Write a protein that binds this ligand. Sequence first.
Ligand code: SPF
Ligand code: SAH
Ligand code: SAH
Ligand code: CA
Ligand code: CA
Lengths: 227, 227
Amino acid sequence: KSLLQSDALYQYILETSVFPREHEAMKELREVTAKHPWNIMTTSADEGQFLSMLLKLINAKNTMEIGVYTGYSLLATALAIPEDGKILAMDINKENYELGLPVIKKAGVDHKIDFREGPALPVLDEMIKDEKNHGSYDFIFVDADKDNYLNYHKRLIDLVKVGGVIGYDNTLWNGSVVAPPDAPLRKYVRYYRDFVLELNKALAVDPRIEICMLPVGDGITICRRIK
Amino acid sequence: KSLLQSDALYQYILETSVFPREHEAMKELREVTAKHPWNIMTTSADEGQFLSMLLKLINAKNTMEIGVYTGYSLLATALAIPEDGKILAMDINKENYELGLPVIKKAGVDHKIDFREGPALPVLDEMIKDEKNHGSYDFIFVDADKDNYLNYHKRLIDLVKVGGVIGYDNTLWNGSVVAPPDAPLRKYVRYYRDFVLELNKALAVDPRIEICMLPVGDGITICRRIK
Ligand SMILES: COc1cc(/C=C/C(=O)SCCNC(=O)CCNC(=O)[C@]2(O)[C@H](OP(=O)(O)OP(=O)(O)OC[C@H]3O[C@@H](n4cnc5c(N)ncnc54)[C@H](O)[C@@H]3OP(=O)(O)O)C2(C)C)cc(OC)c1O
Ligand SMILES: Nc1ncnc2c1ncn2[C@@H]1O[C@H](CSCC[C@H](N)C(=O)O)[C@@H](O)[C@H]1O
Ligand SMILES: Nc1ncnc2c1ncn2[C@@H]1O[C@H](CSCC[C@H](N)C(=O)O)[C@@H](O)[C@H]1O
Ligand SMILES: [Ca+2]
Ligand SMILES: [Ca+2]
């Protein structure tokens, strides 16, 4: 499903504004992923289209992605940034990443990707220690844990430059953020729900960023660093 | 009512992301606009936060607005852009602008507007004649009539520069594609749905832009100029 009022409205957007003129490598990868068990996690085409737009608009060149899976956001990112662009991508799996890596290579853009297998926090902590890494990123996309978002934000805010933009994905969490106390949901969404609400409250109050909650995909909260 | 899954969800977005960080008087003007005698068309609380983000992200300085009325989106733009730059508040026909100018004046940011009254089409045509008004606007937001959109685009595509970004409101027109010819929809909406459906199809195919249909309010299509 989606966050709009009708699956038809959503589709109308896809059929008229996304699928036509959408590279193909995306189409390919989106096809490969459909065969995989956890494909429910791949990000939507409409949202990859928005990310493309945004990347272009802010003319980003150096970026980071936490939560790669298969590679949809990644591919989208690499096809948008300039030829000399660079992306630091982190995921705990890796086998899932290689499942899509063939398509990224087939789009001749895999060279902008530095994949690192393993938990993201450890890495973040080591980067903080080097003052050279501070304010060194144009864009940072966060589509991983959830119970770890606030933790990431603590070091991410010093890694993104003032120019800004950190994207926290899934902030509307399937709407569960307003589900009536009596409408049983999947155990995982019920679990991650407390963290999202908490995450959102913190972001709304954080003086170092500007923020915009866009109901595209499962919701992206765009944060622009102001200090 | 919004275009999202539920009113609650839409409220959540405003409750957590807008009202709190919301600008000064955005609620003033918003309360004012609610006093307007006709109060016919819609005024979304989630647009200001969005244009603000968009505008600062592209570092807009020289912009233009076509279709004011109270000036809500106009205020937002004025507040979001630098005290430096100016806004060619192109025009509108009625003086609902006058009704809100007090607030925009009170928020002291009116010194950026260059309001003009009466049809803009004539004005665009003029501007076009001088080969130097081509690619001189950083951003253009169109929330005018509807049958004039396609007519404006034909001109607007030359007034915006590289990234430029032209935005058009109500591009999803409250749920355009309803149940096939058998839906209980007012004649008023059915009349304009025709121009939207068409506007959408054209925009989706124009090779000079990239576009992106975002579900903010009643729908906003962001167009980035590439050719
Ligand atoms: C970390 O986590 C993450 C997480 C993600 C999350 C992913 C999403 O996919 S969001 C969704 C994108 N994918 C989807 O769109 C497809 C998901 N499927 C759905 O949305 C569903 O169709 C249905 O929910 P539902 O239709 O609303 O139904 P419901 O459970 O709320 O049910 C209510 C009725 O069912 C029925 N009922 C009773 N007991 C049960 C039961 N045990 N089970 C089901 N029904 C019932 C009764 O009649 C209920 O009514 P009442 O008795 O209370 O009056 C599903 C939620 C299962 C990505 C990620 O990557 C970064 C990451 O890291
Ligand atoms: N602590 C952690 N560190 C790094 N990656 C993690 C993580 N916890 C979960 N992940 C990963 O976060 C991934 C993101 S899934 C969604 C995003 C992806 N860019 C896409 O568009 O498909 C999960 O697949 C998972 O393997
Ligand atoms: N030629 C014209 N140019 C601009 N606006 C016009 C117009 N003719 C009529 N209008 C009136 O302009 C109104 C604008 S409603 C715009 C509201 C939106 N929240 C925003 O601030 O962006 C239309 O509903 C219409 O009745
Ligand atoms: Ca996601
Ligand atoms: Ca409007």
